[PDB]
Amino acid sequence: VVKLLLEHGADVXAQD
Amino acid sequence: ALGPAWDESQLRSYSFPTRPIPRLSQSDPRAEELIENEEPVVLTDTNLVYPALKWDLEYLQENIGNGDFSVYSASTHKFLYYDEKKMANFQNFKPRSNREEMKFHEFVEKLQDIQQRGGEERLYLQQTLNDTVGRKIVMDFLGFNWNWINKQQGKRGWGQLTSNLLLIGMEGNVTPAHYDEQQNFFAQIKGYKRCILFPPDQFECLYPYPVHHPCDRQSQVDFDNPDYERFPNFQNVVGYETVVGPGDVLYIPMYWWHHIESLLNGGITITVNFWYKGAPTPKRIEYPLKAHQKVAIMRNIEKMLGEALGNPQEVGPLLNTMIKGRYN
Ligand SMILES: O=C(O)CNC(=O)C(=O)O
Ligand SMILES: [Zn+2]
């Protein structure tokens, strides 16, 4: 739950 | 004794105060302390892209291959990027920058033309380094200081290097304030870029677009004309600032806001960055949370509601309903 909400994406610059 | 590399008159003028990012030797413990603690630092002697310091448009045209390069065009000095996939759910959004694929030599001829015809148009090459590049570039790339940067990757528990972005811009070009979800060693190669960073705890002051908007991760605030009625806390923003030139590496920690400009009347700028995925979430969570962990939370709430509601256009209304007269 906390881990679920703490996970991040890896989006950079233009799109991702 | 070559004189001042650049002066204040080449820097654009803004409404907020800054303090300087520290410039340090890669061997200086303070520089390691800052990186470990996810604060910016300009390293002056990594030799990270030593071999690339001879790069200029002629050497690159001759050597970088026949591959395609993404070149962004803008009618203004600000190059706001937009995620094309997200255009759908904000029908009232028209871009302020087109992207065009072209061969490298076409890009150089484009600059020549604009220059020769006194054009107003601005260009920004931004292309991931890849297989297609010529033998000499491959050799220059292999000559990067991998020993040093690999060690940094091991010490910070980072994930993999996802890419190296090659950036070639015209003097005066601005990348507006935004944050990236990876760690970045930003390796300046030719010319000078002014970098203004803001910590993740100033989220409140910088007013990012909605996650589902094409400009996700950029500030909505026009730095050249801040609308203090819509963005009142922009009056409280304080930046960390530096000017990086050839040989400098700027550590831009994950989630740190950064505004980046090529110095006015400073010629073309060239940069190669190094994007690494961040360390995994820790086994045990320490409270209270760090700011970037809160940004992570907020992004996920926005994502989940967009999905759960079946439509991101309903995220705003639901969120407002949740708070008005209840948490505000
Ligand atoms: O160099 C620029 O103009 C923009 N680059 C970035 O935002 C980056 O490297 O993450
Ligand atoms: Zn960035």
Side-chain angles (χ1 to χ4, degrees), chain A residues 1-2 4-14, chain B residues 1 3-7 9-65 67-84 86-90 92-93 95 97-111 113-114 117-134 136-282 285 287-289 291-328:
Chain A
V1 45
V2 181
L4 180 74
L5 262 39
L6 283 180
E7 79 186 326
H8 49 271
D11 298 346
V12 292
Chain B
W6 57 269
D7 68 42
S9 75
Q10 297 170 266
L11 304 175
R12 302 182 174 269
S13 38
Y14 298 114
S15 56
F16 50 78
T18 62
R19 311 312 311 178
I21 297 172
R23 295 173 91 250
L24 290 166
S25 172
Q26 144 282 325
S27 72
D28 183 329
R30 294 173 295 177
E32 205 82 341
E33 176 188 15
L34 295 164
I35 290 163
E36 173 49 38
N37 293 299
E38 309 203 276
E39 298 170 53
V41 60
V42 173
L43 302 166
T44 52
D45 57 356
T46 62
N47 290 311
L48 179 52
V49 292
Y50 172 66
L53 292 195
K54 67 191 184 268
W55 289 2
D56 55 31
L57 298 180
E58 190 216 352
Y59 179 84
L60 290 173
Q61 180 173 335
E62 193 63 16
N63 280 293
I64 209 181
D68 282 12
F69 289 79
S70 298
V71 185
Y72 295 93
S73 189
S75 191
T76 166
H77 66 264
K78 279 191 288 279
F79 281 81
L80 201 76
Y81 70 68
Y82 69 111
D83 178 335
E84 308 176 23
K86 284 174 180 185
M87 256 190 59
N89 56 36
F90 275 86
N92 289 320
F93 170 78
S97 83
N98 311 283
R99 176 178 60 76
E100 185 176 22
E101 300 304 305
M102 64 188 64
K103 303 304 182 180
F104 196 94
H105 82 83
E106 300 183 293
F107 159 63
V108 182
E109 288 161 0
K110 256 263 194 173
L111 297 164
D113 188 333
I114 290 166
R117 77 174 195 266
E120 219 64 281
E121 185 192 20
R122 291 170 171 274
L123 305 188
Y124 214 153
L125 189 149
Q126 312 188 347
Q127 176 59 40
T128 307
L129 289 171
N130 62 42
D131 282 338
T132 75
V133 303
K136 282 197 210 202
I137 306 298
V138 167
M139 295 290 287
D140 292 331
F141 192 82
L142 289 169
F144 289 179
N145 193 347
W146 295 111
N147 182 54
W148 178 82
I149 202 166
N150 287 348
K151 268 184 191 199
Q152 288 296 310
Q153 181 187 19
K155 277 178 258 181
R156 311 314 152 201
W158 292 350
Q160 77 171 16
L161 168 79
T162 63
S163 73
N164 291 110
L165 193 65
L166 168 64
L167 293 112
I168 308 173
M170 287 165 49
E171 63 189 12
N173 272 13
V174 173
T175 296
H178 72 283
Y179 67 87
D180 293 313
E181 303 192 277
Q182 286 185 49
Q183 308 280 10
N184 184 353
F185 283 117
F186 189 90
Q188 191 63 10
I189 282 154
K190 170 185 239 295
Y192 297 82
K193 284 181 163 175
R194 178 212 208 165
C195 300
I196 307 162
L197 276 55
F198 312 86
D201 66 2
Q202 286 183 36
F203 184 101
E204 291 75 345
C205 301
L206 289 165
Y207 300 96
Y209 287 90
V211 167
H212 293 102
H213 194 271
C215 305
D216 183 26
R217 290 183 293 110
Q218 293 173 116
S219 182
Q220 295 173 91
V221 176
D222 184 350
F223 282 30
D224 296 321
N225 189 35
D227 182 338
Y228 298 131
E229 308 226 324
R230 299 167 64 200
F231 316 119
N233 290 109
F234 187 74
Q235 290 170 117
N236 303 110
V237 84
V238 183
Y240 292 85
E241 165 168 15
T242 203
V243 170
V244 296
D248 295 334
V249 173
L250 171 64
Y251 172 47
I252 304 189
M254 194 175 28
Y255 287 111
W256 283 62
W257 295 87
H258 48 287
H259 159 116
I260 292 170
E261 60 187 41
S262 295
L263 260 59
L264 298 164
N265 297 282
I268 76 165
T269 57
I270 302 176
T271 320
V272 171
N273 73 10
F274 290 71
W275 266 321
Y276 291 83
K277 284 185 176 182
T281 308
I285 301 312
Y287 286 100
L289 295 176
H292 81 266
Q293 293 178 306
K294 287 185 185 168
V295 171
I297 294 174
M298 292 188 284
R299 290 187 62 77
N300 284 327
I301 298 305
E302 292 179 63
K303 286 169 169 201
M304 287 170 38
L305 292 172
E307 216 186 307
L309 296 171
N311 180 10
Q313 277 170 332
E314 298 190 49
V315 175
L318 185 133
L319 285 176
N320 287 298
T321 292
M322 259 207 293
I323 76 147
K324 303 190 216 87
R326 299 222 299 138
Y327 286 106
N328 66 20

